[PDB]
Design a protein around this motif. Sequence first.
Motif, PDB file in Angstrom:
ATOM      1  N   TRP A   1       0.800  -1.222   0.000  1.00 24.82           N
ATOM      2  CA  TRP A   1       0.000   0.000   0.000  1.00 24.82           C
ATOM      3  C   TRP A   1       0.834   1.273   0.000  1.00 24.82           C
ATOM      4  O   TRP A   1       0.443   2.252  -0.635  1.00 24.82           O
ATOM      5  CB  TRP A   1      -0.937   0.007   1.213  1.00 24.82           C
ATOM      6  CG  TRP A   1      -2.031  -1.044   1.172  1.00 24.82           C
ATOM      7  CD1 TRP A   1      -2.721  -1.474   0.079  1.00 24.82           C
ATOM      8  CD2 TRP A   1      -2.547  -1.781   2.288  1.00 24.82           C
ATOM      9  NE1 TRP A   1      -3.638  -2.432   0.444  1.00 24.82           N
ATOM     10  CE2 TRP A   1      -3.553  -2.635   1.796  1.00 24.82           C
ATOM     11  CE3 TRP A   1      -2.254  -1.799   3.656  1.00 24.82           C
ATOM     12  CZ2 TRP A   1      -4.267  -3.499   2.622  1.00 24.82           C
ATOM     13  CZ3 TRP A   1      -2.973  -2.659   4.475  1.00 24.82           C
ATOM     14  CH2 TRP A   1      -3.966  -3.489   3.954  1.00 24.82           C
ATOM     15  N   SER A   2       1.967   1.302   0.707  1.00 22.93           N
ATOM     16  CA  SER A   2       2.812   2.491   0.686  1.00 22.93           C
ATOM     17  C   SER A   2       3.774   2.502  -0.495  1.00 22.93           C
ATOM     18  O   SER A   2       4.265   3.574  -0.865  1.00 22.93           O
ATOM     19  CB  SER A   2       3.599   2.613   1.995  1.00 22.93           C
ATOM     20  OG  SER A   2       4.623   1.635   2.074  1.00 22.93           O
ATOM     21  N   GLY A   3       4.049   1.344  -1.091  1.00 22.02           N
ATOM     22  CA  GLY A   3       5.028   1.246  -2.153  1.00 22.02           C
ATOM     23  C   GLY A   3       6.466   1.334  -1.702  1.00 22.02           C
ATOM     24  O   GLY A   3       7.365   1.360  -2.546  1.00 22.02           O
ATOM     25  N   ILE A   4       6.714   1.379  -0.396  1.00 23.62           N
ATOM     26  CA  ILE A   4       8.075   1.510   0.118  1.00 23.62           C
ATOM     27  C   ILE A   4       8.716   0.130   0.190  1.00 23.62           C
ATOM     28  O   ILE A   4       8.102  -0.829   0.678  1.00 23.62           O
ATOM     29  CB  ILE A   4       8.067   2.195   1.496  1.00 23.62           C
ATOM     30  CG1 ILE A   4       7.523   3.622   1.381  1.00 23.62           C
ATOM     31  CG2 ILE A   4       9.466   2.187   2.120  1.00 23.62           C
ATOM     32  CD1 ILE A   4       7.508   4.369   2.685  1.00 23.62           C
TER      33      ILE A   4
ATOM     34  N   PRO B   1      -0.442   8.766   1.083  1.00 21.52           N
ATOM     35  CA  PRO B   1      -0.112   7.599   0.237  1.00 21.52           C
ATOM     36  C   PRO B   1       1.094   6.782   0.679  1.00 21.52           C
ATOM     37  O   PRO B   1       1.132   5.576   0.391  1.00 21.52           O
ATOM     38  CB  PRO B   1       0.117   8.229  -1.141  1.00 21.52           C
ATOM     39  CG  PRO B   1      -0.804   9.406  -1.144  1.00 21.52           C
ATOM     40  CD  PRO B   1      -0.733   9.958   0.257  1.00 21.52           C
ATOM     41  N   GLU B   2       2.081   7.373   1.351  1.00 22.07           N
ATOM     42  CA  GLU B   2       3.262   6.636   1.792  1.00 22.07           C
ATOM     43  C   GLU B   2       3.190   6.247   3.262  1.00 22.07           C
ATOM     44  O   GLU B   2       4.203   5.832   3.838  1.00 22.07           O
ATOM     45  CB  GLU B   2       4.531   7.455   1.540  1.00 22.07           C
ATOM     46  CG  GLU B   2       4.704   7.942   0.113  1.00 22.07           C
ATOM     47  CD  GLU B   2       4.137   9.343  -0.106  1.00 22.07           C
ATOM     48  OE1 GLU B   2       4.562  10.012  -1.072  1.00 22.07           O
ATOM     49  OE2 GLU B   2       3.270   9.780   0.687  1.00 22.07           O
ATOM     50  N   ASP B   3       2.016   6.356   3.875  1.00 21.28           N
ATOM     51  CA  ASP B   3       1.853   6.065   5.294  1.00 21.28           C
ATOM     52  C   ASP B   3       1.756   4.557   5.507  1.00 21.28           C
ATOM     53  O   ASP B   3       1.220   3.837   4.665  1.00 21.28           O
ATOM     54  CB  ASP B   3       0.592   6.767   5.807  1.00 21.28           C
ATOM     55  CG  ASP B   3       0.456   6.724   7.309  1.00 21.28           C
ATOM     56  OD1 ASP B   3       1.470   6.895   8.009  1.00 21.28           O
ATOM     57  OD2 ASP B   3      -0.685   6.534   7.790  1.00 21.28           O
TER      58      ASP B   3
ATOM     59  N   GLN C   1      -4.698   4.727   6.022  1.00 18.50           N
ATOM     60  CA  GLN C   1      -3.511   5.399   5.510  1.00 18.50           C
ATOM     61  C   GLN C   1      -3.772   6.897   5.571  1.00 18.50           C
ATOM     62  O   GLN C   1      -4.701   7.383   4.917  1.00 18.50           O
ATOM     63  CB  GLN C   1      -3.228   4.988   4.067  1.00 18.50           C
ATOM     64  CG  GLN C   1      -2.184   3.943   3.859  1.00 18.50           C
ATOM     65  CD  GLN C   1      -1.803   3.830   2.398  1.00 18.50           C
ATOM     66  OE1 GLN C   1      -2.670   3.725   1.526  1.00 18.50           O
ATOM     67  NE2 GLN C   1      -0.506   3.870   2.117  1.00 18.50           N
TER      68      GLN C   1
END
Lengths: 620, 620
Positions: A351-354, B155-157, B152
């Motif tokens: 979901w975060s793409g990290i 978006p990066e959470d 979330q």
Amino acid sequence: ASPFRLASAGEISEVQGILRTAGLLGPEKRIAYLGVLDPARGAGSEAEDRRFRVFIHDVSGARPQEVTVSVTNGTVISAVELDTAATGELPVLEEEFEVVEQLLATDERWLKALAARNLDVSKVRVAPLSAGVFEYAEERGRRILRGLAFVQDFPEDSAWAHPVDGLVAYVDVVSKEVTRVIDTGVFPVPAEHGNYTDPELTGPLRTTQKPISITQPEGPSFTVTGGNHIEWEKWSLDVGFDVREGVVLHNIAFRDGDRLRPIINRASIAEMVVPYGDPSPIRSWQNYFDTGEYLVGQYANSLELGCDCLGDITYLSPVISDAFGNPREIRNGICMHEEDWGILAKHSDLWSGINYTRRNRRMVISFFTTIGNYDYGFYWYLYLDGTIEFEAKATGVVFTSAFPEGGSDNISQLAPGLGAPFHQHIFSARLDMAIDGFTNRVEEEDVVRQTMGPGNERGNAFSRKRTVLTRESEAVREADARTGRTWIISNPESKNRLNEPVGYKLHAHNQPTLLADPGSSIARRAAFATKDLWVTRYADDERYPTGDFVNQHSGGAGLPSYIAQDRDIDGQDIVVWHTFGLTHFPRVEDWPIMPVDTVGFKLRPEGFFDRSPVLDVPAN
Amino acid sequence: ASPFRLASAGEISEVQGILRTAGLLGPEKRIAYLGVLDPARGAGSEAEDRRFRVFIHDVSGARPQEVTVSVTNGTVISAVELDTAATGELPVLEEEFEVVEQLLATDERWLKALAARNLDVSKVRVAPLSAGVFEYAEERGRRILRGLAFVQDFPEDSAWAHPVDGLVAYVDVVSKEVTRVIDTGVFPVPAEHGNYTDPELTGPLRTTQKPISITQPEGPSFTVTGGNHIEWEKWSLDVGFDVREGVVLHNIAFRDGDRLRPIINRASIAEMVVPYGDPSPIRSWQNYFDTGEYLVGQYANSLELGCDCLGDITYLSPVISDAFGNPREIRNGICMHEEDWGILAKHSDLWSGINYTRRNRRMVISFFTTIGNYDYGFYWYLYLDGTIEFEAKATGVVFTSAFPEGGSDNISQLAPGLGAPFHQHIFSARLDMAIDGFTNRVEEEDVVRQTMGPGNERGNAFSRKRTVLTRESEAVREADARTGRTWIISNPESKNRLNEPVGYKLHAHNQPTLLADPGSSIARRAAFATKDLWVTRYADDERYPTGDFVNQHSGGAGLPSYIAQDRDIDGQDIVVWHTFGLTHFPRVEDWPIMPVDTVGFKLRPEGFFDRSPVLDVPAN
Ligand SMILES: O=CCc1ccccc1
Ligand SMILES: O=CCc1ccccc1
Ligand SMILES: [Cu+2]
Ligand SMILES: [Cu+2]
Ligand code: NA
Ligand code: NA
Ligand code: NA
Ligand code: NA
């Protein structure tokens, strides 16, 4: 300037002189043990006093002495004459290793036994084996070694391939008398050689291994100051060396942001014992305490670069005292280095793409010792995530016997006619805990299964229970692998940010403990080995699980006597004693030189930190 | 030319075409599983036939099919319509991962639940969780996923920091119906973020770590031929890849002088399950089979040099089949390399004067997979001395919940208001044994304590007993750490030079098995996980301990059904199934991203060789 610094050659020389001036180091004297004492509780006075404890043997038959000396002030603090029938004999001297063979070589019964077997006495080696305490009333108060024989066909031959079974002798090493020679019958001496460097046995060496190069082009990440103080990746500690215990770790602490937080005050392997399980009279007395009887630190190896320790290695060379009080250096006796240790943490999030990957590493402190046929590596590891681990690596040559015709229930066959008796290798780790300070307690943690029913309607729930050990008399514990039993050492007066006490969890390997019958001599002398975990209240003079004088002590010294005091251990200065070991049924692959096998334990943080302590590790 | 070669892109394309021409791959079809079949027993005909097994899903509601195809001949071998209420549903499709969230976003009950909590639907992620089999009669024969929600903030959470407790929904993914929305009450959504790359949380990164350089200046010591055949330091094997199992090892053998000696025909992790121990209705149904339900191989990571695999790395890039039969490459999905592994054997002899040191090393084959919050590394190790070891490394982000006011007996607190339910990670290793050939048997070995008395007068003797498992009905075994229990797989028709059967010993970690109540749904569906060791007679179609179709199967498939045949396993072609796992009570240090924890097992030679197999290792 640190009180925990290694002993120096100059300090040893002063002890020798102090003893000599005081008249305690005459020509018939031998130093059987010499070690520096730790500072007492309350070292915050900055008053340096370096004290040494000395066991002094007398080769003329006089009573030995225990002596405590201040090298700082140049004085004898105390000197006690020992009654060895009461409190035990002194540790085996290296100079006695050859005396057993030489005394037997001129005894008519020993020579008659060798002549019947057509063995030339010049080729017969005799192992100098500790005696224990058994049925022989004449041995009480005498310094006895027992001897088992092995044939060397030539000077570079492995004598272990050629045991002489059915023969044992007992020797009084002070009066130089052979007290008994027991010959139970003739066994063939196994004929095959065990020379693991003989090309006839090795075959052509492999040419397939390509080199592995481990280098640190900017040097190591740890620093060494004051000779033995280490700082590495937030860890801080001092590396000690004692001739009995070997490498000892002091003042293990972790720098959590602004604060240096203590974890372990002192960590050591305080005893180890190898009991044998062969009921033959030739060997049924055999149980050697490599630490307490032989002193594993004095037989530490010099470790060679590229072979014993690979990578960017920093060495320590500890100094010890010989039988005469002269210093000598164990050159390169301790290796220290860091090692890559695979992945530390990794996650790719949908979901975060990290994508996140971090690598782990460990700091290694190790030494290797050799006591006769056996060789042991002792390894302490410090990991980035706060884990502390100990590993013992057992190798060397297995102790051999004949293999009887028609087999044995207690001996493995290794080669035609060659046997290896069953035995264990059991260690005792002494951990003087200091989790965030000295107010500590131990909880035993068991998994709890739950029954399907009201409040657990789908039958999936499970939980855990913790039992605080409050008094020494209830702190003798056994493992239970089936219920996932661990022990947590916590500080009830130091909470994390969730208001829970900080702690560390001890994870055991849950190997079998001492197998001997509880009524046996070895169960009495190695009582520590019958239980997995002991907790005592700290006391300066409670150093070893087996007591100060293990050699020919009749039993019950050390831990069973300590815990009888029934002291309060709930939020107090405590010591954890962990028993762990290998049970060895030798295999063919152990012969003629044994591949390493391992055992150990680890401690992991349990709410010690307020979140993962390795969030600040960079991305390589 | 090897039948065990990896599937190629061209083979996958032919399967797709074969299916299409046969009319089995219409537009409403999805491939849920595609894998190559192993050659049947008796492959010594050299008649190459590469067969693929395919599970075909139908998104229009028609019945799924199991299909077997010959890519060599271009034919459909068999095609069976499946009754999923009977034999189970097909594995979860990656394209269904988003369908749960999107279906709930337009359901009035779901929106009403989010509105009460002031949660914007655009920020709510829904995990697509396997359903299991519980009390809901309407779910029988329907393809159900359950959804738990996480917020979330951007978006990066990290959504795992913000569970929405007290809310669960069930979705029929074929008919696109929300069957139930259960709201048990409002819990605060935990507010702290878990963004382990946020400098606010990490603090300043460390500058203390210096580089560790691992290089092989002459290249690695292993060779790879035919795409996936490895030879390394007398070992020989083939590395397979299956979308369900991940890395599979075939034809593990050891070159003992002149002879290539088989050891293991096929080794894999055939199932893994994560049962949760929280009795809350929101999560008490939660048990996911990452292998059987989600297929761990399709989520394998691309491993990056220097970060995931360090040293001289050789990569394999396996090819798998997407929902439509197109090939795609998992680039750098398998890492292979050798590692230094410390001391192999060491002895300094007091009588021969010989000093001897040899270093060990291991061959590593590994892959990493990510299934939602969890990430697992799978590691197979081959050692110089004949030891085979498997290690699983668990990391990722723990599955979270609210932490209830006043505490929980089944949930750990990680941060204010944030909990982590207790759970286990349990694996099943399937070892198709071939110790010196296919005639094998299993013996259970226990330490035997002996009583002091006649024949054991000093009470030191101990021994061992071995019990042959002769029939499947007696080959369901439990661990016993206290008695040192191991299992030996031997070949009664192949003796070593001492006329003893050759064997290998399995050493378990003796961790707890499945904790759920025996009457629970998960105990029926994951029956393998209730016992440490199972032995079956080999059969082509007995592949997984849980059966072919794990998703929403009502229970009892796989191992309990196999062993009911009560087949002869005493000197026969047998398969060992070993259960091993971690029991996880999450700690503060596991948050916000978990440091690796490990579990595994190893096999060591037990009289397989006629002496140590590493006497020909050179001196570095
Ligand atoms: O490990 C101590 C017992 C021992 C000492 C010396 C030679 C062989 C065995
Ligand atoms: O590991 C399988 C369960 C799962 C799948 C997707 C997201 C979260 C959790
Ligand atoms: Cu041993
Ligand atoms: Cu977990
Ligand atoms: Na006594
Ligand atoms: Na303490
Ligand atoms: Na069914
Ligand atoms: Na088999």
